[PDB]
Scaffold this active site. Structure first.
Site, PDB file in Angstrom:
ATOM      1  N   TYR A  60       0.840  -1.201   0.000  1.00 46.22           N
ATOM      2  CA  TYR A  60       0.000   0.000   0.000  1.00 46.22           C
ATOM      3  C   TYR A  60       0.873   1.248   0.000  1.00 46.22           C
ATOM      4  CZ  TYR A  60      -4.933  -0.694  -0.281  1.00 46.22           C
ATOM      5  OH  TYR A  60      -6.192  -0.953  -0.776  1.00 46.22           O
ATOM      6  N   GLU A  62      -0.434   4.762  -1.034  1.00 43.53           N
ATOM      7  CA  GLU A  62      -1.214   5.915  -1.468  1.00 43.53           C
ATOM      8  C   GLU A  62      -0.459   7.209  -1.222  1.00 43.53           C
ATOM      9  OE1 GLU A  62      -5.635   4.073  -0.766  1.00 43.53           O
ATOM     10  OE2 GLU A  62      -4.743   5.438   0.742  1.00 43.53           O
ATOM     11  N   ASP A 216      -5.631  11.708 -26.194  1.00 43.83           N
ATOM     12  CA  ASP A 216      -5.572  10.341 -25.692  1.00 43.83           C
ATOM     13  C   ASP A 216      -4.826   9.521 -26.731  1.00 43.83           C
ATOM     14  OD1 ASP A 216      -5.923   7.753 -24.877  1.00 43.83           O
ATOM     15  OD2 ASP A 216      -8.101   7.912 -24.668  1.00 43.83           O
ATOM     16  N   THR A 242      -2.796   4.622 -22.473  1.00 45.66           N
ATOM     17  CA  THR A 242      -2.526   3.314 -21.906  1.00 45.66           C
ATOM     18  C   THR A 242      -1.100   2.912 -22.234  1.00 45.66           C
ATOM     19  OG1 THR A 242      -3.303   2.232 -23.903  1.00 45.66           O
ATOM     20  CG2 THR A 242      -4.867   2.570 -22.148  1.00 45.66           C
ATOM     21  N   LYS A 245      -0.817  -1.158 -25.325  1.00 47.43           N
ATOM     22  CA  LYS A 245      -1.097  -1.292 -26.746  1.00 47.43           C
ATOM     23  C   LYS A 245       0.214  -1.197 -27.519  1.00 47.43           C
ATOM     24  CE  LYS A 245      -5.784   0.574 -26.185  1.00 47.43           C
ATOM     25  NZ  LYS A 245      -5.630   0.890 -24.770  1.00 47.43           N
ATOM     26  N   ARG A 251      -0.673  -3.524 -18.574  1.00 44.03           N
ATOM     27  CA  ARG A 251      -1.943  -2.806 -18.650  1.00 44.03           C
ATOM     28  C   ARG A 251      -1.958  -1.746 -17.556  1.00 44.03           C
ATOM     29  NH1 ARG A 251      -4.601  -6.275 -22.081  1.00 44.03           N
ATOM     30  NH2 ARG A 251      -6.440  -4.902 -22.133  1.00 44.03           N
TER      31      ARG A 251
HETATM   32  C1  LIG Z   1      -8.042   5.599 -27.364  1.00 42.28           C
HETATM   33  C2  LIG Z   1      -8.271   4.734 -26.123  1.00 42.28           C
HETATM   34  N1  LIG Z   1      -8.207   5.288 -24.899  1.00 42.28           N
HETATM   35  C3  LIG Z   1      -8.417   4.566 -23.782  1.00 42.28           C
HETATM   36  C4  LIG Z   1      -8.671   3.218 -23.880  1.00 42.28           C
HETATM   37  C5  LIG Z   1      -8.944   2.455 -22.586  1.00 42.28           C
HETATM   38  O1  LIG Z   1      -7.971   1.576 -22.134  1.00 42.28           O
HETATM   39  P1  LIG Z   1      -8.505   0.446 -21.084  1.00 42.28           P
HETATM   40  O2  LIG Z   1      -9.218  -0.600 -21.913  1.00 42.28           O
HETATM   41  O3  LIG Z   1      -7.257  -0.116 -20.441  1.00 42.28           O
HETATM   42  O4  LIG Z   1      -9.451   1.115 -20.103  1.00 42.28           O
HETATM   43  C6  LIG Z   1      -8.736   2.630 -25.111  1.00 42.28           C
HETATM   44  C7  LIG Z   1      -9.033   1.139 -25.166  1.00 42.28           C
HETATM   45  N2  LIG Z   1      -9.335   0.710 -26.497  1.00 42.28           N
HETATM   46  C8  LIG Z   1      -9.401  -0.730 -26.600  1.00 42.28           C
HETATM   47  C9  LIG Z   1      -9.614  -1.027 -28.078  1.00 42.28           C
HETATM   48  O5  LIG Z   1      -9.562  -0.092 -28.925  1.00 42.28           O
HETATM   49  O6  LIG Z   1      -9.830  -2.215 -28.436  1.00 42.28           O
HETATM   50  C10 LIG Z   1      -8.540   3.380 -26.231  1.00 42.28           C
HETATM   51  O7  LIG Z   1      -8.611   2.828 -27.499  1.00 42.28           O
HETATM   52  C1  LIG Z   2     -13.271  -0.575   3.119  1.00 38.73           C
HETATM   53  C2  LIG Z   2     -12.398  -0.312   1.903  1.00 38.73           C
HETATM   54  N1  LIG Z   2     -12.987  -0.315   0.698  1.00 38.73           N
HETATM   55  C3  LIG Z   2     -12.287  -0.078  -0.423  1.00 38.73           C
HETATM   56  C4  LIG Z   2     -10.940   0.156  -0.348  1.00 38.73           C
HETATM   57  C5  LIG Z   2     -10.207   0.478  -1.645  1.00 38.73           C
HETATM   58  O1  LIG Z   2      -9.378  -0.492  -2.178  1.00 38.73           O
HETATM   59  P1  LIG Z   2      -8.281   0.068  -3.248  1.00 38.73           P
HETATM   60  O2  LIG Z   2      -7.200   0.736  -2.439  1.00 38.73           O
HETATM   61  O3  LIG Z   2      -7.800  -1.166  -3.973  1.00 38.73           O
HETATM   62  O4  LIG Z   2      -8.985   1.045  -4.149  1.00 38.73           O
HETATM   63  C6  LIG Z   2     -10.319   0.172   0.866  1.00 38.73           C
HETATM   64  C7  LIG Z   2      -8.820   0.453   0.874  1.00 38.73           C
HETATM   65  N2  LIG Z   2      -8.363   0.761   2.191  1.00 38.73           N
HETATM   66  C8  LIG Z   2      -6.924   0.826   2.261  1.00 38.73           C
HETATM   67  C9  LIG Z   2      -6.604   0.962   3.739  1.00 38.73           C
HETATM   68  O5  LIG Z   2      -7.543   0.909   4.603  1.00 38.73           O
HETATM   69  O6  LIG Z   2      -5.404   1.128   4.069  1.00 38.73           O
HETATM   70  C10 LIG Z   2     -11.038  -0.055   2.002  1.00 38.73           C
HETATM   71  O7  LIG Z   2     -10.428  -0.037   3.256  1.00 38.73           O
END
Ligand SMILES: Cc1ncc(COP(=O)(O)O)c(CNCC(=O)O)c1O
Ligand SMILES: Cc1ncc(COP(=O)(O)O)c(CNCC(=O)O)c1O
Ligand SMILES: Nc1nc2c(c(=O)[nH]1)N(C=O)[C@@H](CNc1ccc(C(=O)N[C@@H](CCC(=O)O)C(=O)O)cc1)CN2
Ligand SMILES: Nc1nc2c(c(=O)[nH]1)N(C=O)[C@@H](CNc1ccc(C(=O)N[C@@H](CCC(=O)O)C(=O)O)cc1)CN2
Ligand SMILES: Cc1ncc(COP(=O)(O)O)c(CNCC(=O)O)c1O
Ligand SMILES: Cc1ncc(COP(=O)(O)O)c(CNCC(=O)O)c1O
Lengths: 472, 472, 471, 472
Positions: A60, A62, A216, A242, A245, A251
């Site tokens: 963790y 953040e 983008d 991203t 690609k 990813r």
């Molecule tokens: C221009 C563009 N921006 C953002 C994304 C989003 O990435 P994620 O899937 O990781 O959220 C895509 C995905 N495009 C997937 C495709 O063209 O098949 C994209 O083509």
């Molecule tokens: C109750 C709860 N729900 C959702 C999340 C979010 O998960 P992500 O960090 O993967 O987004 C947390 C993270 N809590 C981190 C902590 O308590 O230290 C959480 O405590």
């Protein structure tokens, strides 16, 4: 009793979960034994994969390097700092003029965070319409008025379109729309647009209506790093991407933003500086995300080092050359490509003149180990049965294919489409009737066998074929 | 200007491709197994999970659902995702006729935002546990000064409910009174730093009285829920969200569980009414908010869910609870203030204000001793930089095989660390810049660090082989 | 052919439209032959009415005096300026410290414009809950969660309530709620709250949570002008009001707002000034309204001159004394009044201990020429059959009634509620059954006759009883 | 002591408030001694004024006739019922097909209530752009992006425009915008549009995008009642109006809405009925307004009776003939009218070919007792110094003026503009310089005297000139 640490915690996947292990081995074989043409896919390196599957997943972290909400981040901070600095270097950016956030979980999170940073709920955006080649997160709602992407729900979208005859962006209609709609943000870049972008003109339009300009570059980011397409950084305020690609990494997403003194602008005070950094970081965390995925960040740092190399520049050149060669072969057979060619890594193939929809081509190809995706083309309203298929060069280029190999891919595609027509002519256009032709079709089995013979010979990044469970 | 052979860029190990990142991961590996890792949201996942995480699954675009994808090539990805979903229902003892699950959320914060987007329109009203009372950022967090922090307080209208200021337990009477005045569409239960179990039955009574949906975010305690060691939210909640990397001991991911089938009888509700969450939840995850699933996370999650269903995992969850209780009793015996005076789960929340200390000072000194904690808000805090508490969790060290007596030793190390923090503040000052001077060449810090590392080296370590790590 | 101007344009209403003329004449008789107890009603002066029905109705004058979107405003500008200056004078406000916009068409428009000026869509407000005595436009949504007023749709409302046993505003719960909800604007003032307001405590709460503080003094504005109740201007940033209730003017609204230097506050900069004027003006026009209704503005200027007179202060004193005397008589008969009395122009009468709803009492009273309105009391969820009736003193006090006359009104109300109980006892609680008891009811006829005889003892402002068609 | 009722309550205005009385008398003289050309003004009848200034002002009557929140409404209910029935009669509407709410305080309240009835916050609307002739409440924001009307704040506006060659609505551009923007509501009718409306085409566009269609006939409502322009009721779902413009009534608004069975439509169940009535009523009260202004409702009932007369039809014909004759005279002098003429009660005069702005013409005319308003024309961005002036026939036609008198008005306007040019030529275009020519200008004095001489002779509705305080 608790299991010893070694039993549950150190035993290899093959023994802990034979079911999942076998499925991964089957997928490894599938990636080797087919022609993989999804334009948003690639084959990333074993080095990237070793960082992705590592103890970095346990942390963790953040906040930002040096200002975390948790202890223990001495090394995670160095990894994130290296990832950010390598991102700036890969795109030839001066660190006093640009910064980058490398925490977005993927492309769609990166975009939603960039928008949240600079927009209030219901603020207006304009991006390329999905059937014209834009992405879901560029404000997609359908021509029937149905809001699809959350970027059309939490913000107010008015997409701009390509010219209905040439397939190129209609810059005059873009300007007219922007002056009428008055967006706060104009988005450029796309998912299925086969040409480069006039970022200078986008900047002119943005300045005319007082909008921010975001590119983008997800699909072409590898080509941008290699300086093989126009650089959006010359003209855009924010650049999202991203990393999985054409950039050939894990990813993940990244958000680049301007820093430092602003360029001269009438109506703007002197000595003004950009103010994106804090808003963008805040949007990613704590506004939208939680813990960074440090294994992705570490894997991304590896990919960004690899992207800066001369070998990667040659790869990006070869991607473009392979896409052009494939497009030329397809058009030589009489097929319709949007804009009649390509300037990037993909071609968008309009199947409507053939009387076909892209789902039929995708399904038949899939049975032949030719992996594509059906794709919207201009005027489409059906996501189930759109009028196109989209073909990309990055993945097969990563396996070492050159132009003559992509001409063979063109012939495999030509055989697949010919067979799709034969099935439709014999069994009908209704999908339930068409599917009857996909059963015990000798021509499908023979095309599949030919594709496998062709595909299996090439090298595969990411794992050792000599160690894989399924070699036939 | 040639391309690199696939073997060079694509098959060579990380240690050769990127020595800098390799070295940092090796340092992080040593840090994880040579200190005392007490962040309550961290765990050490298994090597088998890590092998699925770092795999060819990262290469696949698979938007949609199994059997209904936007891309070809998903014959095996579909089987992996189906196995992940079925194992998720099995791990939480859920009947597939009554519950479904979406396993695509990239992390916990994405899972929550998608669950909210599925059932809420922009600006609809939510109530979750206030952050200083122990709730999560994504439960509607804005500060007592009115500053909106989480996007869940921007895109939706939040009114947090609080614990009793004297007992530290949730004030169920004020929850009900607030809900009847504010009329939320959704009530959220579950938390990040609440050390007690939840009266889900009472939450359901409140939700029914005001017509709200009821969602439990079991992220922290999901491993304990699967082991049937804490109250099950599924008995009373419409929707249950979770992360998979905390007590569940999996990869970093999220899941959304939702009711299916006939609704229980309710006055005014029609007969034969059925739940209608499935389609809305799926649509919110994709195409509304996310893009391509991270299939390597889904495969790794399937592994973790199989491991969570084992008798060894139930014993682990029992031990996590027993260790947290033993640590709490040890700390309280010395006079340390724990919120609610103990714990019923995997964590304790420690109020440092009676000592005149803030949690950032304790976190910083602990970090120098290889004791990894996080500063944490306690009731009434307004500072995130210098909150009044520190949060201590048992999952990670319990995964290394520690039992109650070992957690008492951890308690003694924490007592030594907090005593040293107080001594430094008395000698050097409360101002952070002055306090920091006491951290240089502090022999007691060095002694405590040495004792911590010696103790930590007594235990095994999951996820990688200590015998093979670079830094021994 | 077109009609000559004299035919269509100069002929009196009595000849052009006998049907409407006859209905106005019947309404005139109804107003001066019954007992008119709606707390938000009054009888305005003939002078106000002459300005209301005038050529001022013909003018488009969007903008502000001296900055209009149309020509021809030489005199409209003087009328609006005089209206504004008289508004400040009527409420004893220094023009350096307070401004006023007199264009709102009515009270609900005034409030919506005031909110629009200082709030963005979905910003948070807290006002007195409707069953506790607040107005629709103070953020009214029901205990069932149904958004009723647009002030709960376009803004985010969290109402505060009275104490469920005493009936007084629960200032501790107000503060607790405000610190949790963090509203941008807190609203005070009400429609059916029978007590004065601790504006000082409201200011303390508003400062603790960083909110603006607005008072809607619509009901008691006449008493405020007469300095007979607490002045909200001492503590509020913005004061809205209607002009047709206790202020005794035409139907219109006003928005008062602070101007000039802000008082000392920790954190705020030096030399900081109020910035409400331009936002409030813009919200009224061009944001929300179109052309001002200049006949209302002119009529309002007349009413504001009348409100500043020594006779008007005496009227406001008498309104309060009449309300107290009425409340004392009703409680002496054993009736339940919210808070056990009044400090203003109204009483709120809880009928629930009698087993009655306010719609039944309102309906029987109406048949006796006793005009009231059913009204929500604390805990009510039914607008159709609420648990109370609200009784106000302004209208009948304007006819010259004093305390002994309001004691007779109390006796008429006691008779009416007694008869309502007798009908329910005989016919039952179902409305269709209750209604059967209202046919050929000799006691209703007798009470109506006594009411009309009493009502005819008094003068009537706004028109000459000696000239009316129906005597 | 209280003043006796007779003293404060029955004494005439002339004695109670000589200051206000004198100002009203000066305004009455002003209305008599000028040429009143504001297109949204009229001179209403004494009979309307007697109802407007009446004891109806004393009554609270929230609700609907027969369903009130207050006692005492036996006669107010009959007045409101008669007002509604006469409204339907005046517009030739079947009461089974149309209803009407007569409570809106004015036109802007009527529109905001109609929108609130059928739209949620942020829903999309399209109306005629203000510089093209639309009203503030039709979604007005500026070409600089500044939101002006609340109808562009609480709803999302995209205005449609006239064609720059013809000055008429560009119907293909309207259709293209509607298909892209997908509004929930399309608004037609306008404030400064000099032509009729193709409601049939608006209905075709609305049907193509699934929008509701509303006409705001405020300006031409009197012409609609007289059947002298196209009826919006043939094609629109909702029709709003004011009552004080060409309808010649008090200042008030009305909302007409369809009721009863819906017309045939594929994609709509059989026996479907309209459902506007309850939503419209609820939006007016209790959503937005408080107590109706019963003196306005009573005055409106009078005006609606007068509007149904044969004399009023002759008036409406004369209004149109006077506007045409005026327009012909101005064009004969070489002036530029938008669209080159008029089909209604107004002309919109583009002053830009003269090198003038409308504020200068308005100010000079005002000094000559010629009452006009400066007005936006196509392309304008300045509300302070727009490019046109708007001239209307209703008010002077109500004084008995016919075509030859309106030709004299044209010559007075020609003299005024000629004088404005001469002042600008001598003193300059800067407003501070131009204003120097307005002081001690003999030609202004002569024009003013000629205007007064011309205006004073005609009859005046609403009061007796023989009784007025100022006869000189
Ligand atoms: C221009 C563009 N921006 C953002 C994304 C989003 O990435 P994620 O899937 O990781 O959220 C895509 C995905 N495009 C997937 C495709 O063209 O098949 C994209 O083509
Ligand atoms: C109750 C709860 N729900 C959702 C999340 C979010 O998960 P992500 O960090 O993967 O987004 C947390 C993270 N809590 C981190 C902590 O308590 O230290 C959480 O405590
Ligand atoms: N130009 C472009 N091509 C692209 C993408 C994109 O974003 N832009 N994609 C980026 O990933 C993929 C397509 N993603 C899509 C996701 C949903 C819908 C859609 O309209 N879904 C509707 C209709 C579903 C149905 O009819 O069956 C829905 O979900 O309700 C379309 C495309 C691949 N090709
Ligand atoms: N076509 C049309 N003509 C019309 C109106 C209309 O609504 N539509 N009007 C309907 O009444 C009047 C004009 N009303 C207007 C009100 C405000 C602004 C406006 O843009 N105001 C800005 C700029 C002010 C300034 O520059 O001084 C503002 O208030 O900030 C324009 C016109 C008269 N003529
Ligand atoms: C088409 C239209 N609709 C509504 C209104 C609003 O009416 P109120 O001013 O009563 O709110 C106007 C006012 N137009 C005034 C003008 O054109 O000068 C209008 O022109
Ligand atoms: C406190 C208050 N504020 C505003 C208004 C609104 O005024 P309009 O009705 O002119 O919109 C009212 C009306 N209250 C009416 C009643 O209490 O009976 C009110 O009581």
């Amino acid at each position: 009793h608790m299991d010893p640490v070694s039993v549950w915690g150190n035993t290899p996947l093959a023994t802990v979960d034979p079911e999942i292990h076998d499925l991964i081995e089957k997928e490894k074989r599938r990636q080797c034994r087919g022609i993989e043409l999804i334009a948003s896919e690639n084959f990333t390196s074993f080095a990237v994969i070793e960082a992705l599957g590592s103890a970095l997943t346990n942390k963790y972290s953040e906040g930002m390097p040096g200002n975390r909400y948790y202890g223990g981040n001495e090394y995670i901070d160095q990894i994130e700092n290296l990832c950010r600095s390598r991102a700036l270097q890969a795109f030839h950016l001066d660190a006093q003029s640009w910064g980058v956030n490398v925490q977005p979980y993927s492309g769609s999170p990166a975009n939603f965070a960039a928008y949240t940073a600079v927009l209030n709920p219901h603020d207006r955006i304009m991006g390329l319409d999905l059937p014209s080649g834009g992405h879901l997160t560029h404000g997609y709602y359908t021509s029937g008025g149905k809001k699809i992407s959350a970027t059309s729900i939490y913000f107010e979208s008015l997409p701009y379109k390509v010219n209905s005859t040439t397939g190129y962006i209609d810059y005059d209609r873009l300007e007219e729309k922007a002056l009428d709609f008055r967006p706060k943000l104009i988005i450029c870049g796309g998912s299925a647009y086969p040409r480069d972008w006039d970022y200078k003109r986008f900047r002119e339009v943005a300045d005319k209506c007082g909008a921010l300009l975001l590119c983008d570059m997800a699909h072409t980011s590898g080509l941008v790093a290699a300086q093989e397409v126009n650089s959006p950084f010359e003209y855009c305020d924010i650049v999202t991407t991203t990393t999985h690609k054409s950039l050939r990494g894990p990813r993940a997403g990244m958000i680049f933003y301007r820093k430092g003194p602003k360029p001269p602008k009438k109506g703007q005070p002197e000595n003004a500086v950009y103010d994106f950094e804090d808003k963008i970081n805040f949007a990613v965390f704590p506004s939208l995300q939680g813990g960074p995925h440090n294994h992705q960040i570490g894997a991304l740092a590896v990919a960004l080092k690899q992207a800066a190399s001369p070998g990667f520049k040659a790869y990006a050149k070869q991607v473009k050359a392979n896409a052009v060669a494939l497009g030329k072969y397809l058009m030589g057979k009489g097929y319709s490509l949007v804009t009649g060619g390509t300037e990037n890594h993909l071609v968008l193939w309009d199947l409507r003149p053939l009387g076909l929809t892209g789902n039929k081509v995708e399904k038949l190809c899939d049975l032949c180990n030719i992996t594509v995706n059906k794709n919207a083309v201009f005027g489409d309203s059906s996501a189930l049965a759109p009028g196109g298929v989209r073909i990309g060069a990055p993945a097969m280029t990563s396996r070492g294919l050159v132009e003559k190999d992509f001409e063979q891919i063109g012939e495999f595609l030509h055989r697949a489409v010919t067979l799709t027509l034969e099935i439709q002519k014999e069994h009908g256009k209704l999908l339930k009737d068409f599917n009857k032709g996909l059963v015990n079709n000798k021509a499908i089995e023979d095309l599949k066998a030919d594709v496998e013979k062709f595909s299996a010979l090439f090298d595969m990044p990411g794992f050792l074929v000599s160690e894989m469970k399924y070699k036939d």
